[PDB]
Design a protein around this ligand. Sequence first.
Ligand SMILES: NC(=O)c1ccc[n+]([C@@H]2O[C@H](COP(=O)([O-])OP(=O)(O)OC[C@H]3O[C@@H](n4cnc5c(N)ncnc54)[C@H](O)[C@@H]3O)[C@@H](O)[C@H]2O)c1
Ligand SMILES: NC(=O)c1ccc[n+]([C@@H]2O[C@H](COP(=O)([O-])OP(=O)(O)OC[C@H]3O[C@@H](n4cnc5c(N)ncnc54)[C@H](O)[C@@H]3O)[C@@H](O)[C@H]2O)c1
Ligand SMILES: NC(=O)c1ccc[n+]([C@@H]2O[C@H](COP(=O)([O-])OP(=O)(O)OC[C@H]3O[C@@H](n4cnc5c(N)ncnc54)[C@H](O)[C@@H]3O)[C@@H](O)[C@H]2O)c1
Ligand SMILES: NC(=O)c1ccc[n+]([C@@H]2O[C@H](COP(=O)([O-])OP(=O)(O)OC[C@H]3O[C@@H](n4cnc5c(N)ncnc54)[C@H](O)[C@@H]3O)[C@@H](O)[C@H]2O)c1
Ligand SMILES: CNC(=O)c1ccc(Oc2ccc(Cl)cc2O)c(Cl)c1
Ligand SMILES: CNC(=O)c1ccc(Oc2ccc(Cl)cc2O)c(Cl)c1
Ligand SMILES: CNC(=O)c1ccc(Oc2ccc(Cl)cc2O)c(Cl)c1
Ligand SMILES: CNC(=O)c1ccc(Oc2ccc(Cl)cc2O)c(Cl)c1
Lengths: 289, 289, 289, 289
Amino acid sequence: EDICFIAGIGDTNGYGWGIAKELSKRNVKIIFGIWPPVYNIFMKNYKNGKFDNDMIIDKDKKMNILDMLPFDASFDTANDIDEETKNNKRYNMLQNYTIEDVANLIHQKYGKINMLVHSLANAKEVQKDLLNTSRKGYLDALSKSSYSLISLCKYFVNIMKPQSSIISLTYHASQKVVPGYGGGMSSAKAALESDTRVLAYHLGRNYNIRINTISAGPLKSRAATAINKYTFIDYAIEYSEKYAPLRQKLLSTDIGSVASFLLSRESRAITGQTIYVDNGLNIMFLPDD
Amino acid sequence: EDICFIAGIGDTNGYGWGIAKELSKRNVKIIFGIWPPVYNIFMKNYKNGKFDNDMIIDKDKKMNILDMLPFDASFDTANDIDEETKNNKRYNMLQNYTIEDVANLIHQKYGKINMLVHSLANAKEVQKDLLNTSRKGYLDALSKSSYSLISLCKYFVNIMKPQSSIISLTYHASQKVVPGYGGGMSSAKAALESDTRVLAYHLGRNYNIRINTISAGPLKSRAATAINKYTFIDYAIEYSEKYAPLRQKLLSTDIGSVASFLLSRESRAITGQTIYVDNGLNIMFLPDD
Amino acid sequence: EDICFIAGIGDTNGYGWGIAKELSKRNVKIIFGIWPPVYNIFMKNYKNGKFDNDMIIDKDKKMNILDMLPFDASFDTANDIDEETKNNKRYNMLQNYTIEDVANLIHQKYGKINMLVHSLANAKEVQKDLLNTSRKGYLDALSKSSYSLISLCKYFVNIMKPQSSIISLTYHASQKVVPGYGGGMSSAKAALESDTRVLAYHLGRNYNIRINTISAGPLKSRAATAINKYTFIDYAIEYSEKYAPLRQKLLSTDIGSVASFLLSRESRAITGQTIYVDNGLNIMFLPDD
Amino acid sequence: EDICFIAGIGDTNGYGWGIAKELSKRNVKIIFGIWPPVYNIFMKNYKNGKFDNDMIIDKDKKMNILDMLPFDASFDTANDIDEETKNNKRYNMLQNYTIEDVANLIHQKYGKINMLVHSLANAKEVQKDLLNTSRKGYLDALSKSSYSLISLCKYFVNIMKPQSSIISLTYHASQKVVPGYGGGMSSAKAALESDTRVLAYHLGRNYNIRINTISAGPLKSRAATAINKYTFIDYAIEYSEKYAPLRQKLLSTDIGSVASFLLSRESRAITGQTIYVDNGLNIMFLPDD
Ligand SMILES: NC(=O)c1ccc[n+]([C@@H]2O[C@H](COP(=O)([O-])OP(=O)(O)OC[C@H]3O[C@@H](n4cnc5c(N)ncnc54)[C@H](O)[C@@H]3O)[C@@H](O)[C@H]2O)c1
Ligand SMILES: NC(=O)c1ccc[n+]([C@@H]2O[C@H](COP(=O)([O-])OP(=O)(O)OC[C@H]3O[C@@H](n4cnc5c(N)ncnc54)[C@H](O)[C@@H]3O)[C@@H](O)[C@H]2O)c1
Ligand SMILES: NC(=O)c1ccc[n+]([C@@H]2O[C@H](COP(=O)([O-])OP(=O)(O)OC[C@H]3O[C@@H](n4cnc5c(N)ncnc54)[C@H](O)[C@@H]3O)[C@@H](O)[C@H]2O)c1
Ligand SMILES: NC(=O)c1ccc[n+]([C@@H]2O[C@H](COP(=O)([O-])OP(=O)(O)OC[C@H]3O[C@@H](n4cnc5c(N)ncnc54)[C@H](O)[C@@H]3O)[C@@H](O)[C@H]2O)c1
Ligand SMILES: CNC(=O)c1ccc(Oc2ccc(Cl)cc2O)c(Cl)c1
Ligand SMILES: CNC(=O)c1ccc(Oc2ccc(Cl)cc2O)c(Cl)c1
Ligand SMILES: CNC(=O)c1ccc(Oc2ccc(Cl)cc2O)c(Cl)c1
Ligand SMILES: CNC(=O)c1ccc(Oc2ccc(Cl)cc2O)c(Cl)c1
């Protein structure tokens, strides 16, 4: 029996979904952590069967989703919840959506898990470039995209057996500048990539639990289209499909199959690493021309 | 005529001072940006001449300090100032200490400058390790150590001629784990190192202004002794003096002479880089033994 | 139906063997390339049952070796053969052991293959440090341990299917200094790591074929002991198990399981990468003790 | 009194020359090591006044060349000399041009020196891409462009003072793929960059002598044009000036000024480093256009 918690899916157009599909391929139970703004919509869609096509793991297996849970990676515990999110329309009718709470919720419903996925970033000010990003926007980008992993680790590490495994998603802009990726997103991925190392040391010696981060190529996810710098993402994708060593469409499932391997024991000797899953685009210095 | 603003000195035991001394060696006017907690003490010391020994640039030149100014890299503009720091004993009798303000203050007293130094980090929760650092502590570590550079850049970039140059100080723990360097300091240096690149792109195309970061070896500065993990720093220093390729005491002046070169036109083709000034300690994988 | 050529074994004590064991787990035919001086000696042990214990893939299946072949990574083609190797005791009673020769021999007997492994190294002068390494020795290290890969790719790419996969092993001594790892091995590994990118481009664009390199941690293999610099290798294992993030004992299979992954469609989105499989040692800066 | 040996010029059109100009600015005697095939041709141009314009260090001082010497980076010692180079038109009327020979010749004429420059490269087969590069060509690239450095250090370290400094040039093609940079040059550069660390250790521990490598941007030198792959080099300069963070035209002096710094006491705390001097191109991922 194998259980994974995937933090950060709102649709089937993301990497979370890709990750979810490949794990199913290996008969691992999938628990979804949905941000509360998009949650009710997501159940509504699910119940109505908009995702039935998308849940097809070819080989006559249906994607096996254990549970779908509200989740906000900005709140550690209940007292971190402010009194405006206490009132908010989307959050009013929901409980147990903080990191501490969903950790407890999952543990009490199903026991210890052994796989953890951090598939969420958020940066209020992504459209304004680094130079023109306010303190508030930066720190918020860091809270939501970087710290959330750390906090996920602190809390979930109590509901994980040894030999467990954690992944997050990052982007190459932390190592090399990509204009357009603003609002501190690059700073945040840079921080995330560094924390992945540090945490690997603590989680390793103390828990025999591994943690790595996947550096993805571009994918036309909802969030990617919202970078809205025909856009940053459509450009990111044409460049990639034309200048990558591997000239094939990069799919959400391509990240999953890698995420899957890392989450398994097969990667028992890899920890602290940023693994590029991106058709090799990062190795290139100049366009062929 | 050459002017540098050095943000973050409280004493002569830091890298700021080292940087200050070497710049003098090249007849560049030095403006000090002092954190207001330690400011009055610092003038008190200065007036009393505790730094007279320390201001000796051997070659019968006295260190040339243009001006000493209160400065808090946590506040961008005046309205960012909270009403407790409005009241505070240390800050009560002081004005113009925000980034926007000291930028204006310097500009109006002396005109455009051409050199900028970011020699400050701060992380409330440095003693607690990454895993056990609260959101508040992390974000605060990022605000004070990483964002401050960005904000320094936004504001000072109006009071700098083209061909100007900016440096910050970082530490190798952003790339490789150093247990003890907690509270998000590593995350912060990681972010700082990434922002140094991004900013180099914006500051370059738009202003013809360069920015680089120096990755220092350890030095027994006041702040280093406060990491207080016979301590993290005394250990960091013994290891270095015994396992570095260069087996010589690393001095504050050693960082300065490099900081000096970067701030000069001599480094007109270097930008976005992390430069290791650390007796080569970073190149080593294993102790000799 | 899946075939893997592993070039670079002489026994069960190395990484090629672990790599081999883990491929059997997926029912992929293995063809072994053995350095001629030790091939007859290897067949002897094979015939005499010495590897039978080592050949068990736990779950009631014998390791399915398809063929074992004499293979020398220093000669590319027939005419690359010098005339004391026409004479040498060991090579005499052997034929078709050059790279183009074993590519054709394999191709002729079994047709198209789809998984390549470079698992060989040699630096004649490894015991002398880099400064005291002669032209002859340096260059022979690079011919044997770096150029052999390119050669393999050049000749094997003819006998491979699209979507095929290649790996090579490497050691972190290329990126950080390991005193004792002399003879130009470090140099060799560095050229390998870089060649892996470059090859990725040509092999990826032109053949839709991927290539990566596994950077392993220390393993008491025959050649690791032959380093002989207790031993260089006793130190490296000792340190790694005191200091690596993961307390556990590293196994050729740990690396094997990873190689198996890189060699499958499950990683179609990864190429040009150095993947570290070293229980995370590479992420550490200083020890804690 | 300061002496620098620059090995690897044939004209005023290269980096050795810019390096040379910038050293004169500090009144350091320069000794030139010229590849024998082009030395007589070089002295001719020298005698005939062709370099006189190029020799002005603006401020009313002629470039002070101490000596120009025949120097071949492929032979270490007298007996390393093959017997068609006993015969060759070009080498015939020349003596003492091996590395140990010119180390002794210099030592004998001028005593101890303290600044070394490796500024030479050759990959016979640069135009063929890595996959199509022969053993002969690969290895000759590595002998000429990587092992020559170590050789220099081995033989020159005898004729140097403590605290002396060494540099070599290198190109980012070792770390990221530049299609067109074939023949094993990239391989060669990679081994150089790594050898620089390793050497740093031995040279630093044993001799208190530093060594670093400058990674430059494209420069239309004689050999850059000889790449001949418009030209590979026209493309690289064109791109660099559209895309590098810094709009300006890169000059051998830009690199020269940096080399001068690395070669002085002003950097006593830097060794084993690759310093990028490329107007910041290396930090970019994608272009904006
Ligand atoms: N799409 C790409 O091209 C690409 C490339 C590189 C990296 N990434 C990374 O992949 C990860 C997933 O992004 P994506 O592109 O798949 O799109 P996405 O829309 O799946 O990304 C955000 C998802 O996480 C959820 N989320 C946001 N804030 C949250 C919070 N506070 N708590 C809980 N959930 C929250 C959103 O509802 C959304 O479903 C991110 O880390 C992103 O940085 C994406
Ligand atoms: N000392 C070392 O061994 C070492 C090693 C690597 C990097 N560094 C870096 O060097 C830089 C300087 O640190 P240091 O070790 O020289 O000690 P330091 O005591 O000089 O560092 C902090 C200085 O900046 C000031 N400061 C702190 N917060 C401020 C704020 N909000 N606004 C204005 N000033 C503020 C303090 O008064 C103090 O003078 C830091 O960036 C640190 O990360 C130090
Ligand atoms: N064991 C470790 O601690 C370790 C760590 C990092 C990397 N590596 C790398 O792993 C790879 C596997 O080596 P290993 O350590 O398992 O030792 P090993 O003795 O199992 O295998 C190395 C093999 O290379 C072979 N070889 C040398 N020249 C050859 C030639 N011309 N043709 C064919 N074969 C040739 C040797 O015969 C030997 O069988 C090597 O590339 C090594 O550099 C090993
Ligand atoms: N120009 C660029 O665009 C550029 C960019 C990055 C790096 N580099 C590097 O800068 C260094 C300087 O080269 P350059 O580009 O100025 O070209 P250059 O023609 O000025 O100098 C290269 C020199 O190497 C010499 N050389 C080759 N084999 C030799 C030998 N055996 N002994 C002595 N000298 C020998 C050639 O004769 C030539 O004079 C080279 O290492 C090159 O790889 C150049
Ligand atoms: C307001 N902006 C956002 O919330 C945002 C922006 C980008 C996001 O992820 C990425 C999407 C595409 C890419 Cl190329 C990299 C990414 O990190 C994500 Cl996950 C969120
Ligand atoms: C509460 N802690 C701090 O305020 C603190 C801690 C460390 C600081 O700088 C360093 C001091 C020593 C080193 Cl080794 C690296 C550093 O970044 C600095 Cl500048 C401040
Ligand atoms: C004469 N020396 C050798 O032949 C030698 C030395 C080391 C070899 O592989 C390694 C063994 C151990 C390690 Cl740590 C790294 C390695 O690359 C190999 Cl495969 C061979
Ligand atoms: C046959 N080819 C050559 O001899 C050659 C090719 C390139 C050389 O230097 C460079 C010239 C340009 C660039 Cl971009 C990088 C370089 O390393 C050099 Cl110095 C020589």
